[PDB]
Amino acid sequence: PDREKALELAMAQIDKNFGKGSVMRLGEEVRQPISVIPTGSISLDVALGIGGLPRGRVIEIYGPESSGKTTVALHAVANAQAAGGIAAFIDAEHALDPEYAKKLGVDTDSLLVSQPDTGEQALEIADMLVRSGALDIIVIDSVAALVPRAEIEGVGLQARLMSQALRKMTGALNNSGTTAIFINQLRETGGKALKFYASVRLDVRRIETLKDGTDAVGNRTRVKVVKNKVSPPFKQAEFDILYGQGISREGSLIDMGVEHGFIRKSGSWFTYEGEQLGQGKENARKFLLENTDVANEIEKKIKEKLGI
Numbered sequence: 181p182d183r184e185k186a187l188e189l190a191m192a193q194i195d196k197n198f199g200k201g202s203v204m205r206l207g208e209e210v211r212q213p214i215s216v217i218p219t220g221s222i223s224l225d226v227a228l229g230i231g232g233l234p235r236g237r238v239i240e241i242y243g244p245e246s247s248g249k250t251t252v253a254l255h256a257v258a259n260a261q262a263a264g265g266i267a268a269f270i271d272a273e274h275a276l277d278p279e280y281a282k283k284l285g286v287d288t289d290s291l292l293v294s295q296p297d298t299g300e301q302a303l304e305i306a307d308m309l310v311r312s313g314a315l316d317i318i319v320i321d322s323v324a325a326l327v328p329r330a331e332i333e334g335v336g337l338q339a340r341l342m343s344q345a346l347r348k349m350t351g352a353l354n355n356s357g358t359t360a361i362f363i364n365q366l367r368e369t370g371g372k373a374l375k376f377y378a379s380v381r382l383d384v385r386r387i388e389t390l391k392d393g394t395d396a397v398g399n400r401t402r403v404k405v406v407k408n409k410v411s412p413p414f415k416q417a418e419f420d421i422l423y424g425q426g427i428s429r430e431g432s433l434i435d436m437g438v439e440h441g442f443i444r445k446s447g448s449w450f451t452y453e454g455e456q457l458g459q460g461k462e463n464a465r466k467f468l469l470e471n472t473d474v475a476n477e478i479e480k481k482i483k484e485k486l487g488i
């Protein structure tokens with residue numbers, strides 16, 4: 181009696197026992213909710229299937245040095261921040277640059293910065309800040325730097341601390357309603373536990389170096405949503421990170437503009453239905469940069485063509 185009906189019968193019997201994303205089809209458009217924090221990268225949001233990182237979920241962002249993971253996060257902050265939310269940053273790398281975070285929309289001033297000493301203590305104050313219901317987004321910098329009492333003193337495994345604090349904190353993170361980012365690094369650890377708690381796990385790798393006549397004006401980044409318990413996994417995205425300026429909205433809107441037929445070429449001269457923007461993205465960008473009106477609706481043309 182019909183696979184289709186037998187499958188969906190049981191397939192449903194499944195979500196009931198293991199949450200939602202317990203099972204999915206790479207096709208499915210669905211949803212049935214939101215709370216969702218913009219990432220400043222439209223490409224990544226549509227590639228996330230929900231328009232941004234879900235709130236109340238634990239998210240892991242791993243990749244090499246200079247990839248982007250931090251920039252994304254800081255952006256995530258800026259958004260969940262400029263939307264009346266309270267951001268908590270547990271720094272264990274002591275590498276964060278305010279002047280860069282500020283230049284992205286992060287109200288640094290009202291940004292909590294806890295500088296732990298023990299990977300154990302970090303997760304503690306990180307967990308409390310979570311239970312205090314006030315925070316909406318918390319971001320731990322370095323799942324690496326989260327070393328225990330020992331090691332920092334003088335056998336076992338760091339991962340135990342992780343499984344511990346993660347076991348306890350995933351739950352609370354839910355009812356609480358705070359999305360928690362975990363930057364992980366490239367040594368190519370507690371990583372295992374995390375990998376299995378993250379409702380969304382993103383892989384961030386720097387695909388190619390940007391150039392605009394001068395030199396290194398930034399970098400191209402490709403993100404692969406390798407784990408996605410909210411929407412369908414394995415989707416991906418790409419955006420432009422400008423050396424000291426964040427993600428390039430304007431540029432991101434172009435990549436979309438052409439991929440979604442709104443913008444056109446013809447001599448490499450990017451043009452939006454009639455009017456020209458200029459030859460070579462570096463100029464069409466400069467075009468969208470100043471003219472917000474056009475850019476605005478190019479966003480509004482693309483943002484409509486897809487989910488929400």
Ligand SMILES: Nc1ncnc2c1ncn2[C@@H]1O[C@H](COP(=O)(O)OP(=O)(O)OP(O)(O)=S)[C@@H](O)[C@H]1O
Nearest residue numbers: 244245246247248249250251277280398422423424
């Ligand atoms: N303080 C800063 N000032 C200007 N640009 C920055 C700064 N920090 C990062 N960037 C830019 O962001 C890119 C990568 O983002 P990162 O913050 O390094 O992300 P990761 O998440 O790649 O970071 P580690 O983990 O490598 S800092 C760099 O190649 C820079 O162009």
